[PDB]
RNA sequence: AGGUAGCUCAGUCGGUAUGAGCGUCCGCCUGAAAAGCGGAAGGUCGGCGGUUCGAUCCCGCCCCUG
């Protein structure tokens, strides 16, 4: 509604639950917090269990008037999925940022659809599976060009968050 | 029974049973045993009501001293184990907020 | 005059809170419910102090309602 981008980072800040609390940033400026309230606060205050809350400072959110000019390629897309193993406390957003930075312009869409822990993964690890949609602006993208972009995305995730391609 | 020998023996039996409890469930069983109605420390107090009047002050501050020593140990242990339980809940409930 | 379990209320005249109903939890019942039976968890006895070996119970002050 404000036409700004935000990032949510882990935080500890009463009255929020320290494992379920995000601090909200616009650029590098903090603008508030969100998440689940602290169980001790809920009990002391007579609140319902599981109560959640958000508070943002609207004055710290800069007013924006963007003028988009989207690139809309009509050429066919290539759909590929990639499964990456990382340490269990690596934020999924950081992995997706790494995948995007390496994939380059041919990547049109990235969506996480699976978060998996289990004995076939190992302890202190988790597996993230992303659906990727590749597309070129001037041609029918080949699977090899898409796979090369995918390989560069996997390499970027290796260098930035220690991602290991799932085997 | 109100002697400073059977009393201090019962405080010591209680203070080490409290020290050896690593669970709220274990500590609950310890509480009913060393502080409940059938405890030596609680029966020592119910005996103060049938005691001659000239013997209640000299033996009451003794029985009270024994009760307050085991009560202090249980209360500090209950808070310690509850905090450990509560802290463990917060870590177990962590999520990826991104 | 009263404040007693999460709420609504009996009760305790200095050393065992003796409790109910509701609510909650747990069984039975239902495919699952509501309701209905059955059982369990649940009490610094309004706060700060005094007195006393010991205070829900006595004394002082104060908060809360008729
Ligand atoms: Mg494909
Ligand atoms: Mg996976
Ligand atoms: Mg049935
Ligand atoms: Mg029972």
């Amino acid at each position: 509604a404000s036409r700004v981008d935000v990032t949510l980072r882990p935080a500890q800040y009463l009255p929020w639950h320290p494992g379920r609390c995000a601090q909200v940033f616009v650029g590098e400026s903090s603008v508030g917090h969100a998440g689940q309230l602290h169980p001790a606060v809920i009990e002391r205050s007579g609140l319902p269990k599981g109560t959640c809350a958000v508070e943002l400072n609207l004055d710290a959110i800069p007013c924006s008037a963007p003028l988009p000019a989207p690139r809309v390629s009509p050429y066919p897309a290539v759909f590929q999925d990639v499964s990456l193993v990382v340490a269990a406390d690596i934020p999924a957003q950081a992995v997706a940022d790494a995948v995007r930075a390496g994939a380059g312009d041919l990547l049109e869409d990235i969506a996480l659809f699976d978060v998996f822990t289990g004995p076939q993964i190992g302890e202190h690890r988790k597996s993230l599976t992303f659906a990727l949609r590749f597309r070129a602006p001037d041609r029918t993208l080949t699977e090899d060009d898409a796979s090369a972009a995918r390989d560069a995305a996997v390499q970027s995730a290796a260098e930035r968050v220690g991602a290991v391609l799932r085997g | 029974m109100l002697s400073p020998e059977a009393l201090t023996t019962a405080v010591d039996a209680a203070q080490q049973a409290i020290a050896l409890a690593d669970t709220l469930d274990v500590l609950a069983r310890v509480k009913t045993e060393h502080l409940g109605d059938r405890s030596p420390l609680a029966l020592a107090r119910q005996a103060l009501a049938v005691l001659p009047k000239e013997q209640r002050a000299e033996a009451g501050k003794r029985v009270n001293a024994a009760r307050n020593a085991a009560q202090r140990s249980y209360d500090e242990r209950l808070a310690t184990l509850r905090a450990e339980r509560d802290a463990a809940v917060l870590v177990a409930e962590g999520i990826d907020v991104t």
Side-chain angles (χ1 to χ4, degrees), chain A, chain B residues 1-4 6-8 10-36 39-57 59-98:
Chain A
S2 306
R3 290 189 296 184
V4 298
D5 297 315
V6 288
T7 54
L8 280 60
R9 312 179 186 161
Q12 289 77 42
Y13 188 61
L14 288 172
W16 278 274
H17 185 310
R20 305 186 170 184
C21 171
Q23 187 176 12
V24 190
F25 288 81
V26 172
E28 293 308 312
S29 296
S30 173
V31 305
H33 294 77
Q36 187 176 329
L37 290 193
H38 194 295
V41 175
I42 287 172
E43 184 178 21
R44 273 197 293 270
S45 306
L47 303 167
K49 274 173 187 180
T51 296
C52 295
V54 181
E55 182 159 27
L56 313 174
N57 178 9
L58 265 189
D59 283 8
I61 300 175
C63 276
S64 75
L67 295 173
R71 305 160 42 202
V72 190
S73 173
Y75 294 94
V78 174
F79 300 79
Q80 292 174 353
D81 301 347
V82 61
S83 188
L84 301 168
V85 186
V86 293
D89 53 11
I90 300 293
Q93 185 59 40
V95 186
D97 285 353
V99 167
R100 178 185 283 106
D105 288 331
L106 292 180
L107 181 66
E108 169 177 283
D109 194 79
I110 167 180
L112 173 77
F113 66 90
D114 188 67
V115 184
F116 182 74
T117 70
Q120 55 275 85
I121 300 309
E123 273 199 11
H124 310 108
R125 295 169 176 83
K126 67 185 173 190
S127 191
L128 313 178
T129 306
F130 296 89
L132 313 171
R133 181 164 79 244
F134 293 99
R135 200 192 299 269
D138 53 2
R139 63 197 163 96
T140 299
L141 191 61
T142 74
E143 287 185 340
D144 283 3
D145 282 58
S147 294
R150 183 189 77 254
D151 286 338
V154 173
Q155 173 68 25
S156 176
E159 305 166 329
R160 286 158 188 246
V161 294
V164 172
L165 197 57
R166 178 88 176 270
Chain B
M1 277 297 101
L2 309 182
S3 54
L7 257 47
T8 312
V11 174
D12 298 352
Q15 283 186 331
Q16 65 179 343
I18 289 164
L20 266 52
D22 298 332
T23 308
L24 294 174
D25 299 312
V26 177
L27 183 54
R29 306 174 186 177
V30 170
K31 170 195 174 183
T32 53
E33 173 181 315
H34 291 97
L35 281 80
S39 169
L41 298 196
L43 285 178
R45 293 182 56 259
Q46 305 175 4
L48 302 175
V50 297
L51 200 67
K53 298 312 178 76
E54 17 98 17
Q55 300 172 350
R56 293 184 180 187
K61 64 175 58 178
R62 209 180 315 114
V63 174
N64 284 333
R67 253 268 226 179
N68 296 133
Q71 193 74 60
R72 242 184 176 270
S73 300
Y74 168 78
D75 296 336
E76 296 179 8
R77 191 86 187 121
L78 180 63
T80 293
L81 298 179
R82 275 178 176 166
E84 292 181 359
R85 174 200 64 193
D86 295 355
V89 173
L90 294 177
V91 40
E93 296 182 346
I95 63 172
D96 179 2
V97 309
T98 80

